[PDB]
Amino acid sequence: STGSATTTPIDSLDDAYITPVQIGTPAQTLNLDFDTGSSDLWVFSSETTASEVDGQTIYTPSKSTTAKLLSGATWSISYGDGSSSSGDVYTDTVSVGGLTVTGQAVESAKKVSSSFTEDSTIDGLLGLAFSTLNTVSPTQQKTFFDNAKASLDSPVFTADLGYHAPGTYNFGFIDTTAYTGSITYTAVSTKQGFWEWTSTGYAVGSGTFKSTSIDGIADTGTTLLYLPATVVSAYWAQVSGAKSSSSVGGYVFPCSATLPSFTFGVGSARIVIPGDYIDFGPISTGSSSCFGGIQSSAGIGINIFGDVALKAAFVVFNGATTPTLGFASK
Numbered sequence: 001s002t003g004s005a006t007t008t009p010i011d012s013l014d015d016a017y018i019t020p021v022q023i024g025t026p027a028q029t030l031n032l033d034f035d036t037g038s039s040d041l042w043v044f045s046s047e048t049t050a051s052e053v054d055g056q057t058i059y060t061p062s063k064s065t066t067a068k069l070l071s072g073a074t075w076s077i078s079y080g081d082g083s084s085s086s087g088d089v090y091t092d093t094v095s096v097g098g099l100t101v102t103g104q105a106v107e108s109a110k111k112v113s114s115s116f117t118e119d120s121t122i123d124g125l126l127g128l129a130f131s132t133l134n135t136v137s138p139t140q141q142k143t144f145f146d147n148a149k150a151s152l153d154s155p156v157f158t159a160d161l162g163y164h165a166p167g168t169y170n171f172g173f174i175d176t177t178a179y180t181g182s183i184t185y186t187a188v189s190t191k192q193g194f195w196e197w198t199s200t201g202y203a204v205g206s207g208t209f210k211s212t213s214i215d216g217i218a219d220t221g222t223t224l225l226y227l228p229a230t231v232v233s234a235y236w237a238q239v240s241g242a243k244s245s246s247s248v249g250g251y252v253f254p255c256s257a258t259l260p261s262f263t264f265g266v267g268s269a270r271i272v273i274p275g276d277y278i279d280f281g282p283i284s285t286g287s288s289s290c291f292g293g294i295q296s297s298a299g300i301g302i303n304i305f306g307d308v309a310l311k312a313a314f315v316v317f318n319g320a321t322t323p324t325l326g327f328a329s330k
């Protein structure tokens, strides 16, 4: 089997991407944030504290004839950005782009933090990291991909995120028309539960490529590109007037600037992030200071190849017995 679904930016800045997902019988379609950095499929629901719902579409398990409460199971998750959610667990039928899994754990939120409440466009998350990170207790549950994998034509999914435009998540096949050149594959460590890999270096604009190992994670659920302070300083030094602002929480730059590209290495291959992809717009409405899309990972403890990087590539998440990642230009 295969599946194919369009993923759409939630706003004009590509702050996140949503993909429609069918849950239950009859189907309830929710728009979920597909997140290769986490491993829980959780949704706003009829159980979510009413004051914490503000425009989201909710899953109502009592209206699904295939929903079953998973006895005694609870979940609770905190994301690196300070947000959190928790609740109980059903199993139900879940379909993405025509690919169906029966018995998928659907984590129903009883509580969500304010950043989720304030995101009316995101109805929940669909985790695509390794199932060792799943938070369901006392019995850990499998991700949608892990449940689907045996049925897929090939044990893979691909992320093709758009810049200011829709893109695609495919399951079970590699669309050879969706990229240029070849796909370069690179080793993955699953020891922290992430799609963790080592970039071979970087360049800023037309500058020399710096060969240096950068360990990080391929994370569709993180918007920005978080890299070591040395690398980030080298990038922003090429933007007149850019500075790191402690009050704003990162590098900012004059909105009148034209940003240089940023290149990262995948083996001997190179992925070029156009400068425009690094502009996240005014820090506050009407400001002429703009927020940068490349930020330091120093506070984080891990480098993160988020949407800013991944949207410049066609990315293969190969879930074979020994997982690997593939990157192509597009």
Ligand SMILES: CN(C)CCNC(=O)c1cc2n(n1)CCN(c1ccnc(N)n1)C2
Pocket: 035, 036, 037, 038, 039, 077, 078, 079, 080, 132, 133, 134, 135, 219, 221, 222
């Ligand atoms: C019981 N087992 C051993 C652990 C259960 N899971 C975790 O400890 C865990 C930590 C994170 N996540 N799960 C998922 C969201 N996170 C992140 C971090 C970075 N990027 C993203 N997208 N999510 C951080």
